[PDB]
């Protein structure tokens, strides 16, 4: 291969340009085991993007120049081969085939070339298609005879879509699994890469930072992979140190990770133990009133996270029973923003539309050949995208029996089988079920007799199966809100729009007489404290638009509104 489409990794390892490859030695030995074969000496590094597939080959190219190769791979000039640059420039017939036969002629003359084709899935249909002169069919004769040594690097998905699907190419290539490193393996990688990133940034990097880079990237980043994600934290923190300047620490990694996810450095640089020690006071910030509920779930999460925890249970299962919209999904959002630092972790499934077991095949995915195969079965993109999550099952009493027979897995194990065959882990997810099985007192202070908390408890036993209810951690019951409890919610929500008023130098001069009437109008004992915000926008914000209807802007108008008494 010329130095036109690739790069001599063997000559890069002579000049000490390749990064040290710590670990992955079972894989470098496996690649040598494939390359030492007589025929079809062609390994494929199958992994994920960033697990160190190129690093295995960089570690192999170091093992060639250090003489650690078994007199079949000695003095093999290992070249990469960018097939993307090799396709690039083919707008005419025969351009790609000419640039590939020049490479293939160069390997024939020298006889000591090992190709490394990153993205070997590109080989299929690189020229035109499968049955056509592509890069696959050009290389297939010499790959089948061991006369072209080629290290591939696909992912597991791309190996199955392109190499296993292509008949007469799955045989030419030998799968070498490069798994994602563990966190303790990644710390050993970072400590081996310590001298490279200390010398580049001229910034000392401590052992506290490299443990923090591997641990927090596995937790907070779940679209990328360990080796890379954690190196990128070490690399970006050393780079942002250069734009501040001598030492990268635990807190410096949490800052450059907080700029990616949006978690405040504090929620990254914390300590589960303290992290959940002042849990109650931070969950009061968006739940005022119904305080025994907050202290119950704050106690339950601190039991089922801190200290002992089996890995065969979720972080907490909850039944939120009681009156609707009094803080039911408002607490679960407040728990999700406490969970690891992101409010965007709450998922409403809205089980009220389900009154069918056939629609459970439209919730957990369809059997293939049926409708509901793409949307439905979307739990892959949600909960194994985010192992730290909160799933809310609103109105579970509306659903069919067969729907939560499939939910008996996730309370026992913490795993779920998708309709497309995925392991959708509910392992760290706080699952929360929800039923307004209580509406009797709710429906006026009368009942079925001739004349609270335990009325809705035995309605769960009446409606559901006891097999489902007892795996659930704690059942939380909400009560009717006192008028002193409602006006604090009015106080919290009138202050939300008040910040948008002084942006325009307007001021809603607050009075408590209007706040009592908002509590009367924005609450009923069937639905209340959910339509309180529409009561705010219909009764306050309609009449504050009458200011600019009669054109009141000025430097600022101190408006005070009070509607009549009821």
């Amino acid at each position: 291969v010329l130095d036109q489409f690739g790069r001599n990794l063997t000559a890069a390892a002579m000049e000490g340009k390749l990064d040290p490859v710590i670990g992955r030695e079972k894989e470098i030995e496996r690649v040598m085991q494939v390359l030492s074969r007589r025929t079809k000496n062609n390994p494929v590094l199958i992994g994920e993007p960033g697990v160190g597939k190129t690093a295995v080959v960089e570690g192999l190219a170091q093992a060639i120049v250090h003489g650690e190769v078994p007199e079949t791979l000695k003095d093999k000039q290992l070249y990469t081969l960018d097939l993307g640059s090799l396709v690039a420039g083919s707008r005419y017939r025969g351009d790609f085939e000419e640039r590939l036969k020049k490479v293939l002629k160069e390997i024939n003359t020298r006889g000591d070339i090992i190709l490394f084709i990153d993205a070997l899935h590109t080989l299929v249909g690189a020229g035109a298609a499968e049955g056509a002169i592509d890069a696959a069919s050009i290389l297939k004769p010499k790959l089948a005879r061991g006369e072209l040594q080629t290290i591939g690097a696909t992912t597991l998905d791309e190996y199955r879509k392109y190499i296993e699907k292509d008949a007469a190419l799955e045989r030419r290539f030998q799968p070498v699994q490069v798994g994602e490193p563990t966190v303790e393996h990644t710390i050993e990688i970072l400590k081996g890469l310590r001298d490279r990133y200390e010398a580049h940034h001229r910034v000392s990097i401590t052992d506290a930072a490299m443990v923090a880079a591997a641990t927090l990237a596995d937790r907070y980043i779940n679209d990328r992979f360990l080796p890379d994600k954690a190196i990128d934290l070490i690399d970006e923190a050393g780079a942002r140190m250069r734009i501040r300047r001598a030492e990268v620490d635990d807190e410096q990694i949490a800052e450059v990770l907080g700029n990616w996810t949006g978690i405040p450095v504090f929620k990254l640089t914390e300590a589960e133990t303290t992290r959940l020690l002042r849990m109650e006071e931070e969950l009061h910030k968006r739940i005022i009133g119904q305080e025994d509920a907050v202290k119950a779930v704050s106690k339950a999460i601190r039991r089922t996270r801190a200290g002992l925890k089996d890995p065969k249970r979720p972080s907490g299962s909850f039944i939120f029973a009681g009156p609707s919209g009094v803080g039911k999904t408002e607490l679960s959002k407040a728990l999700a923003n406490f969970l690891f630092g992101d409010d965007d972790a709450l998922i409403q499934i809205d089980m009220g539309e389900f009154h069918d077991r056939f629609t459970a095949s439209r919730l957990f995915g369809a059997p293939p050949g049926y409708v509901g195969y793409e949307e439905g079965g979307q739990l892959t993109e949600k909960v194994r995208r985010k192992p730290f999550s909160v799933v809310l099952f609103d109105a579970i009493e509306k659903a069919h029996q067969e729907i939560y027979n499939s939910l008996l897995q996730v309370l026992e194990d913490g795993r779920l089988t998708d309709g497309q065959g995925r392991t959708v882990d509910f392992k760290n997810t706080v699952l929360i079920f929800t039923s307004n099985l209580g509406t009797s007192d709710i429906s006026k202070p009368v009942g079925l007799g001739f004349s609270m908390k335990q009325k809705v408890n035995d309605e769960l036993k009446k409606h559901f199966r006891p097999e489902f209810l007892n795996r659930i951690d704690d059942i939380i019951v909400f009560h009717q809100l006192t008028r002193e409890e409602i006006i604090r919610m009015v106080d919290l929500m009138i202050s939300r729009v008040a910040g948008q008023l002084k942006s325009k130098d307007m001021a809603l001069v607050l009075t408590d007489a209007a706040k009592a009437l908002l509590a009367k109008r924005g609450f009923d004992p069937v639905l209340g404290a959910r339509p309180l915000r529409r009561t705010i926008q219909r009764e306050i914000e309609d009449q504050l638009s009458e200011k600019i209807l009669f054109e009141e802007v000025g430097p600022g108008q101190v408006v005070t509104v009070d509607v009549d008494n009821w």
């Binding site: 083919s90 005419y92 017939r93 020229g127 035109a128 056509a132 050949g369 049926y370 409708v371 195969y373």
Partner: peptide
């Protein structure tokens, strides 16, 4: 109940040979 997933065949062809203009 069933859905058939069809298969939208794309038009894919090899690159065009060109004819050259000569400059002596």
């Amino acid at each position: 109940m069933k859905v058939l997933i069809l298969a939208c065949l794309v038009a894919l062809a090899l690159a065009r040979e060109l004819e050259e203009l000569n400059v002596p």
